[PDB]
Write a protein that binds this ligand. Structure first.
Ligand SMILES: Cc1cc(OCC(=O)O)cc(C)c1Cc1ccc(O)c(C(C)C)c1
Ligand SMILES: Cc1cc(OCC(=O)O)cc(C)c1Cc1ccc(O)c(C(C)C)c1
Lengths: 116, 115, 116, 115
């Protein structure tokens, strides 16, 4: 469906497995409303967060719990989390893949936006 | 200078100049209280945000207005901003350089943490 | 199969399509021998470069023609190409995904190495 | 200083120190002729590789020995090295900073190209 997140580990060269993340939508009143959540699979992917009709226009935030991921590996990393904040579907529906690449003191994030 | 931010532009191969950003400290009630801000210099750098005495342990957020930067260049961006959230000084004062590399649909951020 | 390359465009937020690349293997005599080549698909992927039995231990180089990609979009980029040089299969066979993320003056590259 | 290389370590959040690298210029017969080398300082920087007069147009390669760096830290790396291949000075002399960010299974490289 319309929103997928793929998370890689740049130290081990592997998908980043069991990484928790929470998705929020900015409300009319400017607050962050809980939208969805899940944890990455063995392939570092999280699918099924939302549907085409629920995923309307708006500003979305994906908060990826990268600190817990590193802590479980014994590492105290720099970032509390990796955030990804973006306007979605403002020219009509699109399908978003959020790619995140994680190191203890660095994190990249990239979007692949395609038309269904 | 305990906190410095350096921003580069991966499309133009240059420092990212006049990029605004705000720094926040997480309050006891878990809200973000803004306490410093600035814009990058002609070398893409922002210095002088805080002092050693002020920069106590806590959770800090740097919100970099990448969307305005790309809009000023006439380039469509993906992100609303780039946010850098970290716990500072957890075993003593350190000097933090946040290095941010910007593309319209991608950014990376790195910390260089010294003495 | 054992070697896949996925190339993304960080300016347009899209797969980088029709990107040419050449794979070389370092020979016993230290020269770079042509190993395989291909161009990325509409999904920014190149598959079928090699087989499990051909892809023996050795030092491999993937030379991705990123300059031509940017030039065809009107852009004069920094890099002549993005190279990816690595020892493969030295603890037994593995499956390698090379992920490359391209901007006119920057390029990241990451490997996902998994056991079949 | 027409060419500077700055290398950071994404695992330790620090400059990458004592990283060796070699610089080559592509010859007329398409072989690479080595002409400069050095290792990064305690701030992860390598200066003084060439001079304005020597650094003429051509295709240059910087080969960064990331594998030795990771081996010295006891960390398994993926890449044999990180190579930065570019045409220099194509419309006049510029000042190039190559910024490299290193992880064991990933690296990124960026050019900051000025006047
Ligand atoms: C977008 C994407 C999807 C994907 O699906 C799974 C697979 O093909 O195995 C597999 C890969 C490797 C990518 C590309 C990707 C995925 C994550 C990632 O961090 C990066 C860096 C360039 C930031 C690239
Ligand atoms: C190129 C550079 C120059 C620099 O001078 C600032 C100082 O004097 O501390 C300080 C730093 C940290 C960098 C490195 C840098 C600066 C920004 C940046 O986005 C990147 C990414 C490639 C990771 C690296």
């Amino acid at each position: 469906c319309p929103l997928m997140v793929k998370v890689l580990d740049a130290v081990r060269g592997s998908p980043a497995i069991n990484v928790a993340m929470h998705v929020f939508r900015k409300a009319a009143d400017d607050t962050w409303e809980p939208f969805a959540s899940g944890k990455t699979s063995e392939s570092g992917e999280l699918h099924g967060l939302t549907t085409e009709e629920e995923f309307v226009e708006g500003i979305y935030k994906v908060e990826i719990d990268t600190k817990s991921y590193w802590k479980a590996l014994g590492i105290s990393p720099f970032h509390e989390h990796a955030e990804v904040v973006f306007t979605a579907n403002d020219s009509g529906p699109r399908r978003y893949t959020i790619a995140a690449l994680l190191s203890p003191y660095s994190y990249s994030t990239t979007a692949v936006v395609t038309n269904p």
